[PDB]
Design a protein around this ligand. Structure first.
Ligand code: NI
Ligand code: NI
Ligand code: NI
Ligand code: NI
Ligand code: NI
Ligand code: NI
Lengths: 566, 100, 101, 566, 566, 100
């Protein structure tokens, strides 16, 4: 028959041309395509479509998907489309039209007796976030991150030890082995970073052979040219990534010396703006190079009225600095610059910075990587208007550029994009379902490896799952053996070959990293700009092609006081 | 006391409501979680008093008005649901469009 | 209305019926109190209690199960004993029998 | 010597002829028999009976029990007696007289050096409850149920997914395998139900071969005659049970058509009254048939003043129904009938309905199966007086009839009565100890497989276990490997033979279901009435042999506001 | 250059000659030695010493430690010294000077790429406590104890069962096996005690062969001469320890008879003062014998104004005693004597009592063993002044005498001193780091087997680990497989040989007890006094060599209201 | 704060008592858990004040009377026990037959 667009949207979610506001921000997305056949949408419930002989077929388990997310509005780096998502064997099977080929047309995702259903009509579905700057200070960080929508965590640490408080390093074989074993207990995918600060190659190779997927070079352990060169030589031969936190003190040289030591080899620069660490005051100039994959940590995102004030004392504690020791205080102060903090937001909007991360409990908030990324997008739309790449009256392009910062780009930078990072066939089914009013703030469902792992849940004894109090609780995908089957522990190719998984008796699924040396700035999705950027040594002003880059601090931000109790 | 898991869970709701209650008292416009906790806690006390499900479904729509909460909040709460031990056992109270 | 209340019918219960019993005068000669349990082999109680140990052989106190009889220093009293049943094999206590009888 | 009856009761609990009030209800039980020898009761403590050479013998572990519950007042379908209970190897060893044969008479339960003691004097001991209508919406339901006194949970689901929100189905091999693995983490016995809605036999056999012990036919997936017939054909050949939630919409036929499709084959009808689902308005007439094993879900038990009011909105959410869609609202309304809700309580009192269950978080309360069953008994005694079967001045028979509804009958219906369901020798030692004042409300101790799994526990740092705050906390029987050894995962005979336990590497003890096809109404303990029942199509009035069946709604119920904080 | 002592202390912690107050007590410790080379102390942080080529060397993992605790102030039975502590393979590697031999002098603890760092400057480090009187009433006790600084727990029980409520006994093979399996889930080292009350040797040997490391003789199960003799005969042949709770009732004989039954064989007497159980009123005289290793339970430590008052009702509940049964009340009253309670504190100060323990939830507080020991030391310094052994103006000797009571002495008494009990090379790295202001009250870090297992942790989402609320949370060392690797399950030599670990499939590291029969009073570190002690049968007065021993009750104690919220 | 597990556990008791306190204030007859929480919390504050174990054992019997609680409640509570940090450390207070 015929149905009005409004009634249609209320029943099956929005379709082509409809726009949806992201949470309480000024960002609007417009549905670009709809893969359904009007009248043949599948809907579950009493008397609905998904029933024997109707929307559900007679095929065996092998010929149908295990799970289908119906009428989902996908927001990913490649598009913002309406479609059904099929999941089989814990991986993304297809993005298309679900149903029963026996009576329905254009069915690409067969629903059978073995198919579970998740109703996504009116919801937005995205890939799980990937935070590549984790400090394993406490295991509680995994639940916090998972609840925010982050499903993969890469970093290093051994617990609340001084070394881990300051750096993302899991020092040596013993601790690496211990942490790989502990990782099986956590509901997120995990990869470890070893201590890359040594001028003896063999000491690095041991760590890689033990299981780390990368090496962290941190100034607290000595970010000298000799150390940097050593770590990159081993990385080049073992196909693992290097994450850098440069010499802030300019003790061994200036930024140009560090860059020279790197010698055009691939490297991931952490908190490229500088507040979180790095050559003062120009480490930010690294984003101009083709071999540098630059990321930001989140406390400086976005630039607000209270940013500068909160930063000093935060600097001290994280690095074991003495506020009475003048040299310890002067050094902290040269790290906090309003000039570079304001520029960072713009550089993100232009695509010069390619990733966002937390820097969990060491000058960063583990549960705010996604939330802060969207706050930056909002503040940039408000201040700079539409991007040159935008088409139509929506913010679709800006949304794709920003979502790539915590999904596909971190995955590419660390050599795990073959497993996770986006909603594409063959990748692990790590998905996050969101209600538009709470997008980026509080997820409706977090799926890990094809199983729901955490979700808001009301009174356990209630007649329905919705009565208060509703708060996040671990689900079946976070339990014992089901968890092992739904999560991945990433190993270096060397560790995988040495049989580290068998030796430590690791229970979870194993995945190997590869392609860490061949990624360059040009490979970062929607964020490959290499600007001719300069920093004034005296005033700290940032300029690109001579034009001053800057922005104004926000007094109020969306995704803040309207959603949180504290 | 022999508190079961559900009794302890409700203690979390009661406490969340205490936070909201004090803020409303200062004259602040409540946010999403504060509003849900406040109305929810109101209903549980209604049940302790012995009020019927029918009465509470109505009274619950008069706890907070649109002028006492932040913009967008009324629209974020199409309904509020909570269960409590009435004199005749556990019952579910659903308050539709509680804020107007 | 009292939740879970009992409604015990009036009367009394006869304990250890159909079994041999005997009375014995016992005196605590020690300077410290001695308390004996309902099922302890009376013939092997604390040596400070003076009585005819031979008569108490194979006997225990004829008192409700789980209760006891206390003897303060110098206390003398007459107790009633009831004979052990089952296999009538005594093992343990002060290790004087460790076998049947 | 001699002792007064009152003093005796205070020390060893009540004996023959004494009566005890169940919680704050009007139900009174009278001790029918006492298996002790007065004067030889065993009591533990300083200077008590259970000591070397006295109440404790010299036998080796193999010749004595591991645990003894002393002076327990057993309430079970076969009797209400006073006795000692012996547990050995995780199973009920004997019900009789405990002690040392060396000095005590009539000892049938030998206490030795290897015997632990639980003092049950003044307490009531029952078998663990069995809830056969679980929706695995969240893992937290297991703790809630265990705390209420339910030790076995049968149902289906994959977490908070739309399919599971509405139905008790664990769709297909992948999800079935995943849930069997997750089950090892839960402190209750578990059996899964697969999706029985298909007209292709092989799609059902796959699920059974994968591990399900039954198939759920739900209208949301299409409860058509073709689907029903298919599921029953597979059930007949694989010895698994079928649970039915019929076609409420009368879309494919009326109740008489569904009954015809069943064709006299064994089937378990869920929420036979109708509010929870089923042909409107006469699904209740199914209790007249010999092959139907009828159960009730708990929100309608017992009929009270607020029952009808709370039901409408509860109906909507659970089934993904739209209150704006008139057809969705009219259908919900035809399900909620005061007439059938009032009749249901009486039918339970007469033995026409044989089981009670929850329907956890989908129109039912997981922690209130036991509590609500007793509330129905109370309301029925108050309204109808003594049952025709009662003898003496007590409610002993009514108590046996009602306790059977959530213990032995659910076990028989699902083919697991050889393992659990009652306090009989050889069965798994799943026991619940209750203080009379809190019977059916808050247990004193919940024992799983011979180990205490959860119990109220006071201040952990206190000098004794009783100081406040006292609340339920997991015990050793709920921990890691001890839990695996004390719980059971039920598999179909086919799965057991295919080595599913070895393949998924299941850690818990395994048990196989059998005898699901041969049970009929006549086998339901104390609940085998097949009444000539009719429902008026227009007025919805229920009549048995022409007499109108009905009852009055309660304004206040026992086991309610006197025990709960909220 | 030169640096002032105060500035030095602020940067590296105190050095030789400096004194530090223990919490808010009157006890002061003076640094006896400092193993560093002034100017070469290692410090971690931005621009500090521990960096590549500087304080960190180029050695492979095998040639450097895994963890180093820098500038720690060690308080142990052998000394109070300042030094760096090296940990390798989960064990104490060395106590000395850490650094890089390439540029630094006197380095005995090499720091390399594989070394994690814990900054202990300004902190006090001690061995983990060992509580040998545990009642396994609930698993929650392990976290409570761990948080207090106790890392090894020895005791018995099966959960909240009457037998366990009263005694530390894990009765028989079945329960022993079940508890050994559950122990893998707990973050502390564990050893079990079986029921030693039997006059049949084989019934004891079975329990030892099943896994217990000792046998508990308790009066509730019959502490008769026959039982005692039997247990000691088996202990002598199987190298396991016996813990005694004597016949309070003097039912089978007086204290002199029990002593005679023991016959000079090694035995550990629990709560030797008597309030917690034992021959009334003179069980305390046992501390005069060379074969008796005497310990105190904590509710009587130290003697305060509310002590007597709280004791009566506590007595009743723990032992299943009836306050209406006169014999049950008179017996409880003869156990609580102001005279022996006052003497106990002095006997501890003199070294006549060698251990302190809890008696968890059965007349003792699991989280207060360490705290109460120090309160006794404080009260004794205040009342009796300096010990005859003190040298210098400090309380160093009294501190060594008291710390030995809950560390090395309990370890020696139970045959596990080869694994734990003190900070010596080769022992398991169970360490507790304390801030001086919170010494003995709330630890800063609790390390188990080389991994942090629990520590205070602030807001998980915060930018740093310090923001409120800060409370104790489980760390990586308490998670799954990492935990198994960092904890020990102690077995008897017989069980180890029978392959009990393989049979039960125990996951944690296994350790065997030995040397339980050869320890005597003379072996108790700093607590080997055998006084000529007498107790007046009528007045209960305690006298040593005729002099009356007594003390005054405290009205206010340190380590109390200043630290706890409740 | 460095809250240990026992301190956090007591926060649960304090909160349970807040619920009861407000209900008593409305004039309701308290139930079993409300009564236990109220008297228990009273004692913990008594200890914070520095009252002796002996005094509290008595004062605790005068917090609630039989006319302020539901029928059967006094009989469901033969005694109440709670521990708190007194000036001289942790002590156990046992109040026998608190409600009369
Ligand atoms: Ni950094
Ligand atoms: Ni960092
Ligand atoms: Ni149903
Ligand atoms: Ni259901
Ligand atoms: Ni004892
Ligand atoms: Ni004890």
């Amino acid at each position: 028959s015929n149905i009005s667009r409004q009634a249609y949207a209320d029943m099956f979610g929005p379709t082509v041309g409809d726009k949806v506001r992201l949470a309480d921000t000024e960002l609007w997305i417009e549905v670009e395509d709809d893969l359904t056949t009007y009248g043949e949408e599948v809907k579950f419930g009493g008397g609905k479509v998904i029933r024997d002989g109707m929307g559900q077929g007679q095929m065996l388990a092998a010929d149908c998907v295990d799970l289908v997310l119906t009428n989902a509005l996908i927001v990913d780096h490649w598009g913002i489309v309406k479609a059904d998502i099929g999941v089989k064997d814990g991986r993304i099977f297809a993005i298309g039209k679900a149903g029963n080929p026996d009576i329905q047309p254009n069915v690409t995702i067969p629903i059978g007796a073995a198919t579970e259903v998740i109703a996504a009509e009116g919801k937005i579905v995205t890939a799980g976030g990937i935070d590549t700057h984790i400090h394993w200070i406490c295991p509680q960080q995994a639940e916090e991150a998972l609840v925010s929508g982050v499903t993969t965590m890469v970093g290093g640490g051994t617990g609340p030890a001084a070394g881990t408080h300051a750096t993302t390093c899991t020092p040596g074989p013993w601790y690496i082995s211990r942490m790989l074993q502990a990782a099986d207990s956590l509901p997120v995918n995990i990869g470890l970073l070893g201590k890359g600060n040594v001028s003896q190659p063999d000491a690095l190779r041991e760590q890689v052979a033990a299981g780390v997927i990368g090496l962290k070079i941190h100034e607290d352990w000595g970010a000298t040219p000799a150390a940097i060169d050593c770590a990159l030589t081993v990385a080049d031969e073992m196909d693992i990534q290097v994450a850098l936190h440069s010499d802030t003190l300019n003790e061994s040289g200036f930024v140009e010396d560090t860059l020279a030591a790197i010698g055009g080899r691939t490297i991931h620069t952490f908190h490229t703006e500088g507040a979180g660490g790095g050559h003062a005051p120009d480490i930010i100039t690294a984003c101009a190079h083709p071999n540098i994959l630059p990321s930001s940590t989140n406390p400086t995102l976005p630039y607000t009225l209270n940013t500068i004030d909160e930063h000093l004392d935060m600097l001290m504690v994280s690095h074991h600095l003495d506020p009475d020791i003048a040299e310890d205080v002067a050094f902290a102060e040269s790290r906090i610059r309003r000039e570079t903090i304001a520029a960072e937001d713009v550089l993100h909007d232009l695509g010069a910075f390619s990733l966002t991360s937390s820097d969990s409990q060491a000058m960063g908030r583990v549960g705010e990587v996604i939330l802060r990324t969207w706050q930056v997008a909002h503040r940039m739309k408000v201040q700079r208007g539409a991007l040159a790449e935008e088409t139509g009256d929506n913010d679709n392009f800006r949304v794709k550029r920003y979502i790539a910062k915590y999904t596909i780009n971190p995955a590419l930078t660390h050599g795990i994009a073959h497993e996770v990072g986006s909603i594409e066939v063959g990748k692990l089914a790590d998905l996050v379902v969101w209600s538009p009013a709470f997008f980026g703030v509080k997820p409706a469902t977090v799926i890990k490896g094809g199983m729901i792992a955490i979700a808001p849940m009301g009174d356990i004894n209630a007649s329905i799952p919705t009565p208060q109090p509703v708060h996040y609780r671990p689900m079946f995908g976070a339990l014992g053996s089901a968890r092992h089957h739904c999560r991945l522990t990433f190993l270096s190719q060397a560790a995988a070959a040495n049989g580290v998984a068998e030796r430590l008796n690791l229970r979870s699924a194993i995945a190997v990293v590869k392609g860490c040396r061949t990624v360059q700035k040009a490979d970062m999705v929607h964020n490959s700009l290499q600007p001719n950027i300069t920093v004034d040594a005296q005033t700290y002003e940032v300029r690109v092609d001579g034009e001053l880059i800057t922005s104004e601090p926000a007094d109020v931000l969306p995704m803040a006081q309207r959603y949180f109790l504290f | 006391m022999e508190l079961t898991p559900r009794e302890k869970d409700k203690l979390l709701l009661f406490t969340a409501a205490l936070v909201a209650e004090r803020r409303l008292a200062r004259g602040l416009k409540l946010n999403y979680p504060e509003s849900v906790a406040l109305i929810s806690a109101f209903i549980m006390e209604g049940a302790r008093d012995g009020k019927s499900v029918a009465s509470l479904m109505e009274e619950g729509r008069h706890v907070l008005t649109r002028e006492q909460v932040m913009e967008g909040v009324p629209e974020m709460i199409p309904d509020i649901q909570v269960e409590a031990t009435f004199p005749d056992g556990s019952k579910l109270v659903t308050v539709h469009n509680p804020i107007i | 209305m009292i939740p879970g209340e009992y409604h015990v019918k009036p009367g009394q219960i006869a304990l250890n019926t159909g079994r041999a019993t005997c009375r014995v005068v016992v005196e605590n000669h020690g300077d410290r109190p001695i308390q004996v349990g309902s099922h302890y082999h009376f013939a092997e109680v604390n040596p400070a209690l003076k009585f005819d140990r031979q008569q108490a052989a194979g006997y225990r106190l004829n008192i409700p199960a789980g209760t006891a009889v206390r003897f303060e220093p110098g206390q003398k009293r007459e107790v009633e004993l009831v004979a052990f049943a089952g296999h009538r094999a005594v093992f343990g206590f002060r290790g004087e029998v460790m076998g049947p009888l």
